[PDB]
């Protein structure tokens, strides 16, 4: 089974980094 | 542009993560409040849009590389097809934090897919 796109992301980016990124995006949405 | 490149890649990662978060939340019977779910859903869809856009902005690069390999047994459209598989492989593996352009990064993956496709048909 080939690695999915998520599998690849998980190799290079911590979940804490991903949370920070998601927050920065949620922010641009709500502004506004 | 190199700048718009990074913005697209961030949107992709955020979208992937938003997707995973909702998937794993489902696996534990928990649901997000409707307001969160709506934003997560938007981020997920925005990520897929960013992926399509990054792909689209680099299809011409696939074509320029494929033209190097015409007239050697493989039809032009077949070169482009294989080149495109190289391109999405680069998209999924690309790391925007390193500092180099995506197009620079994709070049090797695109040539590789084309090269291996030509060797394996023969």
From Swiss-Prot, chain A:
Signal peptide positions are: none
What range of the parent protein does this fragment cover? Answer: 77 to 108 of 111
Q: What is the lineage of its organism?
A: Bacteria, Bacillati, Actinomycetota, Actinomycetes, Mycobacteriales
Q: What does this protein do?
A: Binds to RNA polymerase (RNAP), stimulating transcription from principal, but not alternative sigma factor promoters.
> What protein family does this chain belong to?
Belongs to the RNA polymerase-binding protein RbpA family.
Q: What is this protein called?
A: RNA polymerase-binding protein RbpA
Which chain regions cross the lipid bilayer? none
Q: Which domain of life is it from?
A: Bacteria
**Subunit details for this protein?**
Forms a complex with the RNAP catalytic core and with free principal sigma factors.
Curated annotation (Swiss-Prot), chain B:
Sigma-70 factor domain-2: region residues? 54-122
Which keywords does this Swiss-Prot/TrEMBL entry list? Answer: Cytoplasm, DNA-binding, Sigma factor, Transcription, Transcription regulation
Q: Where does this one sit in the cell?
A: Cytoplasm
Q: Does the keyword Transcription apply?
A: yes
Short sequence motif named Interaction with polymerase core subunit RpoC, residue ranges: 78-81
Write one Gene Ontology MF term.
DNA binding
Q: Which GO terms describe its cellular component?
A: cytoplasm
User: Which is a GO BP term held by this UniProt record?
Assistant: DNA-templated transcription initiation
Please classify the protein's predominant subcellular localization into one broad category.
cytoplasm
The organism's superkingdom is given as: Bacteria
On whether DNA-binding is a keyword of this UniProt record, the answer is yes
- Domain comment (free text): The sigma-70 factor domain-2 mediates sequence-specific interaction with the -10 element in promoter DNA, and plays an important role in melting the double-stranded DNA and the formation of the transcription bubble. The sigma-70 factor domain-2 mediates interaction with the RNA polymerase subunits RpoB and RpoC.
The record's family statement is: Belongs to the sigma-70 factor family. RpoD/SigA subfamily.
Q: How does it assemble?
A: Interacts transiently with the RNA polymerase catalytic core formed by RpoA, RpoB, RpoC and RpoZ (2 alpha, 1 beta, 1 beta' and 1 omega subunit) to form the RNA polymerase holoenzyme that can initiate transcription.
Purpose? Sigma factors are initiation factors that promote the attachment of RNA polymerase to specific initiation sites and are then released. This sigma factor is the primary sigma factor during exponential growth.
User: What is the protein name given in its UniProt record?
Assistant: RNA polymerase sigma factor SigA
Q: What is the lineage of its organism?
A: Bacteria, Bacillati, Actinomycetota, Actinomycetes, Mycobacteriales
Q: Which residues of the full protein are shown?
A: 242 to 363 of 528
